[PDB]
Amino acid sequence: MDDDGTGQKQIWRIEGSNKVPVDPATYGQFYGGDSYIILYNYRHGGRQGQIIYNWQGAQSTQDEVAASAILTAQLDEELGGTPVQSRVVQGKEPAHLMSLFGGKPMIIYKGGTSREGGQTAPASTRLFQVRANSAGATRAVEVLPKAGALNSNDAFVLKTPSAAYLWVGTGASEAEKTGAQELLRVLRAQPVQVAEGSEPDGFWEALGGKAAYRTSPRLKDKKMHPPRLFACSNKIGRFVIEEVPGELMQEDLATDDVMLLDTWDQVFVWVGKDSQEEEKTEALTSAKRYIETDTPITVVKQGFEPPSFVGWFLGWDDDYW
């Protein structure tokens, strides 16, 4: 897609069985608990065009997903069947969708709406993980405001009732720092800038006390062989290993298989709780083989992941499974 992302867009959120307009002043901000529809009208190389992006937040329920399916069939038909359709889950957005918000980062809040509970209110202390990919696309994902949630590879924003902080990992890029600044503008708070290793007492206090967090040599490295995740499985009748692209999300770890995370200087073998013995044995064999064609191999179990592993994921919830 060569279009520059500056065409007219409309964004609706799924609320029960309806789609409901989102405040246009907040375009680029989404609730991870919800599902959205973006109708993007553009003009490129002489001709007009249309795309519908169906965006699914990582905590969106199965009924929201079914309701957007009907809602998109309705929109498609209202428009005469003219648009290009594309389904997208959180963290796997193509470049073109990321460009729609004017160089701003996509911001993803905790919470959302449901038929039962309505619109959740924002917490009074919130933490945001700001990560950008090789190509400069930036995502700011809200997580639980604990010290353990930090990782040296990224920038973070911390907003309390009384103060705001912009924490900067040793490994954080300039695109991640810029993105944190833009989140801070949307939050209407002015930051105290904080480098990793020289945090003020107020920063730790606001996170609930100082603690160990997600770090390693590789996570700390600025230079960036950026890490690769693989799914290993014998569910089809034989053992195979395929790559999982896009941002590393916790949903990508298949709980009935074994996963390999290659951070170059190390290889993690994550073992799903419903994976079979043979999947782990063969994955250990394949990792060892891949390494020797040119390094610790660390085995980790679902629910008992060390911080060196978890730091590579964009958002982690300890009560996800």
Positions at the binding site for Ca(2+) = 33-34, 64, 76, 81, 83, 113, 153-154, 176, 256-257, 279
Query: Beta-carbon neighbour count of residue 43 at 10 Å?
Result: 12
196 binds Ca ion (CB under 5 A): no
Letters for 135-154 (x = contact with Ca ion by CB under 5 A, - = none) are ------------------xx
282 binds Ca ion (CB under 5 A): no
Residue 155: closest CA among 193, 189, 123? 193
Query: Beta-carbon neighbour count of residue 153 at 10 Å?
Result: 25
257 binds Ca ion (CB under 5 A): yes
Dihedrals phi, psi of 236, to nearest 5 degrees: -80, 5
Please identify, among the stretches 188-196, 206-214, 250-258, 291-299, the one whose residues bind Ca ion according to the rule CB under 5 A. Answer: 250-258
By C-beta, is 1 or 123 nearer to Ca ion? Answer: 123
By C-beta, is 112 or 191 nearer to Ca ion? Answer: 112
Member of 256, 278, 317, 318 binding Ca ion (CB under 5 A): 256
**Contact partners, residue 223, CB within 8 Å, separation at least 6:** none
Q: Where are the alpha helices (DSSP H) in the chain?
A: 62-78, 95-99, 174-187, 201-206, 217-220, 277-292, 307-310
For residues 253 and 272, is the Cβ–Cβ distance under 8 A? yes
Please identify, among the stretches 47-55, 79-87, 195-203, 229-237, the one whose residues bind Ca ion according to the rule CB under 5 A. Answer: 229-237
Question: In whole angstroms, how close is the CB of 206 to Ca ion at the nearest point?
Answer: 22
Rounded distance between C-alpha atoms, residue 88 and residue 249, angstroms: 14
Letters for 7-46 (x = contact with Ca ion by CB under 5 A, - = none) are --------------------------xx------------
By C-beta, is 51 or 143 nearer to Ca ion? Answer: 143
Question: In whole angstroms, how close is the CB of 153 to Ca ion at the nearest point?
Answer: 4
> Coil, strand, or helix at residue 208?
coil
DSSP string covering 99-156, please? Answer: HTTTTPPEEEES----TTT-SPPPPSSEEEEEEE-TT--EEEEEE---GGG-BTTSEE
Question: In whole angstroms, how close is the CB of 151 to Ca ion at the nearest point?
Answer: 8
Please identify, among the stretches 48-56, 224-232, 256-264, 310-318, the one whose residues bind Ca ion according to the rule CB under 5 A. Answer: 256-264
Question: In whole angstroms, how close is the CB of 79 to Ca ion at the nearest point?
Answer: 26
Please identify, among the stretches 45-53, 120-128, 194-202, 228-236, the one whose residues bind Ca ion according to the rule CB under 5 A. Answer: 228-236
Residue 59: closest CA among 122, 115, 114? 114
Question: In whole angstroms, how close is the CB of 46 to Ca ion at the nearest point?
Answer: 39
112 binds Ca ion (CB under 5 A): yes
Residue 108: closest CA among 96, 124, 126, 95? 126
Please identify, among the stretches 217-225, 233-241, 242-250, 288-296, the one whose residues bind Ca ion according to the rule CB under 5 A. Answer: 233-241
Question: In whole angstroms, how close is the CB of 171 to Ca ion at the nearest point?
Answer: 6
Q: Which residues of 48-75 are buried (b: 16+ CB within 10 A; e: fewer)?
A: ebebbbbbbbbbbbeebbebbeebbeeb
Residues that bind Ca ion (CB under 5 A): 33-34, 112, 153-154, 235, 256-257
